[PDB]
């Protein structure tokens, strides 16, 4: 069959011969970032990062090659009722308006797993590390945190909540009025969640070894990245409730509204064919076939099938304004499309600094958001601030806000 | 896990859909990415450009 020329990640694209080829490349890149159930024994694994979707659905429009990728068994995405409309301006320039009521009902909700590990490694007869709950009167250098979440073994228990300045593993190293130093493990800053599983074992070296899995539920929000299977990625721009969403005559509000302007320059016509075929599939009860090179499926046959179900044959519907109730003058293309929630969330990316840690050598702010570092005001930014003539802003960026010294 | 049924894999807290093909090295699952190279023992004749050699047949 000629559709065996595609690999694993391009075999999930419905109608890839109707797409411009860079968009197939982008979906092959972004199907690997899609959130689903990555493996069925995810409750046993202490992976450092894990992303499990609450309600993965298999696609309504499928290729025949996804029976062998096991995508029907471990799917990564949800069939979303997707209107292609300009609504209130919040889906412009590759954005998505989402239904807040759908998101409240579990639409694209997911759980994030972070795993932390510590070895209770004795290094000689001088420096001994112990899993124990530190106390102020005994341990030096405790980080002014909440230390009573820990149990008697120095390890936190499943079910406890933790914020970014909480300790989960209490580790003290004996010090050669303070017998030992605190070398405990805290969560990542600006993180939160429930302790999900604490596993205690011993490694090859025979030392006590813990892995603690912390779970946090990530509800979709503004700035979370969603993509279809046609390279049509975009952050959530706003979330409207069901009574603000546009609706059909039978009360169907779209889960997602994407911009019309995402289509013409990209020519993802397979996206529109997948919406049409998904409308036909959801009304018929079939799962549509979107195997690439098929003469049994063209747009006219899908249209005739759709018009057999009391719909417009081209998949448009008369939507009503959610705010005013008035009919929208244009008829809106709306139908079920498989969206993926990508691992690029905004709460994993938001970072600000005011003043904090500085590098030991050059006394400039640290590197990266994981250590409360600053952003590099680089050479091109310096060049642009030169072109502005803003000499004092350039001076405070490159002298006062990084490393003032005398 | 070779030749085990789905029930035996689920008894070992393994996923029956897991394909394998990787190594567990210090608890990290490590996959060997296939590396391409020129085929050996085959005579290839190229034109080295802007060089003292007009043609070059390597093996």
């Amino acid at each position: 069959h000629p559709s065996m020329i595609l690999g694993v990640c391009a075999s999930i694209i419905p109608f890839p011969d109707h797409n411009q080829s860079p968009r197939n490349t982008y979906q092959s890149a972004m199907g690997k970032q899609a959130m689903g159930v990555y493996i069925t024994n995810f409750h046993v694994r202490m992976d450092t990062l894990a992303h499990v979707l609450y309600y993965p659905q298999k696609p309504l429009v499928t290729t025949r090659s996804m029976e062998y990728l096991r995508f029907r068994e471990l799917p990564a995405g949800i069939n979303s009722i997707v209107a292609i409309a300009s609504y209130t301006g919040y889906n412009q320039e590759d954005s998505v308006i989402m239904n807040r009521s759908a998101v409240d009902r579990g639409f694209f909700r997911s759980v994030f797993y972070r795993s932390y590990k510590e070895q209770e490694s004795k290094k000689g007869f001088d420096q001994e590390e112990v899993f124990e709950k530190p106390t102020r009167e005994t341990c030096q250098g405790m980080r002014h945190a909440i230390y009573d979440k820990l149990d008697d073994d120095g390890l936190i228990a499943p079910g406890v909540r933790v914020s970014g300045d909480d300790v989960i593993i209490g580790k003290t190293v004996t010090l050669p009025r303070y017998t030992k130093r605190d070398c405990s493990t805290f969560l990542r800053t600006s993180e939160t969640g429930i302790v999900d599983q604490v596993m205690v074992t011993l490694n090859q070296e025979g030392y006590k070894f813990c892995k603690i899995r912390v779970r946090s539920v990530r509800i979709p929000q503004i700035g979370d990245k969603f993509a279809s299977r046609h390279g049509q990625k975009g952050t959530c721009g706003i979330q409207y409730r069901q009574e603000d969403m546009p609706f059909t005559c039978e009360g169907i509000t779209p889960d997602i509204i994407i911009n019309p302007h995402a289509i013409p320059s990209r020519m993802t016509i397979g996206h529109l064919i997948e919406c049409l075929q998904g409308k036909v599939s959801a009304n018929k009860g079939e799962i549509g076939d979107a195997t690439p090179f098929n003469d049994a499926v063209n747009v006219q046959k899908i249209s005739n099938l759709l018009s057999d179900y009391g719909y417009h044959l081209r998949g448009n519907e008369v939507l009503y304004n959610g705010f005013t109730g008035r009919k929208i003058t244009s008829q809106i293309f709306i139908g079920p499309t498989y969206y993926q929630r990508l691992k690029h969330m905004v709460d994993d990316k938001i970072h600000s600094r005011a003043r904090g840690p500085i590098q030991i050598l050059n006394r400039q702010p640290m590197e990266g958001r994981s250590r409360d570092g600053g952003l590099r005001f680089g050479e091109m930014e310096r060049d642009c601030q030169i072109a502005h003539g803003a000499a004092q802003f350039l001076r405070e960026r490159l002298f006062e806000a990084s490393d003032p010294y005398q | 896990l070779n030749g085990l049924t789905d029930r035996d894999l689920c008894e070992l807290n393994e996923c029956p859909l897991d394909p394998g093909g990787y190594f567990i090295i210090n608890g990290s699952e490590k996959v060997l990415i296939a590396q391409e190279k020129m085929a050996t023992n085959t005579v290839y004749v190229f034109a080295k450009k802007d060089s003292k050699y007009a043609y070059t047949g390597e093996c």
């Binding site: 069959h1 065996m4 694993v8 025949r64 062998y68 | 394998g20 093909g21 996959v31 296939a34």
Partner: peptide, 29 residues
Amino acid sequence: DEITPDLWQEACWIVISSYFDEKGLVRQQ
């Protein structure tokens, strides 16, 4: 006798199903 053009689209996916039934997807590794 032979596979007619109407049975071909199911014959080819039967043989692809048999291929992936033995070989799987990580057979090279």
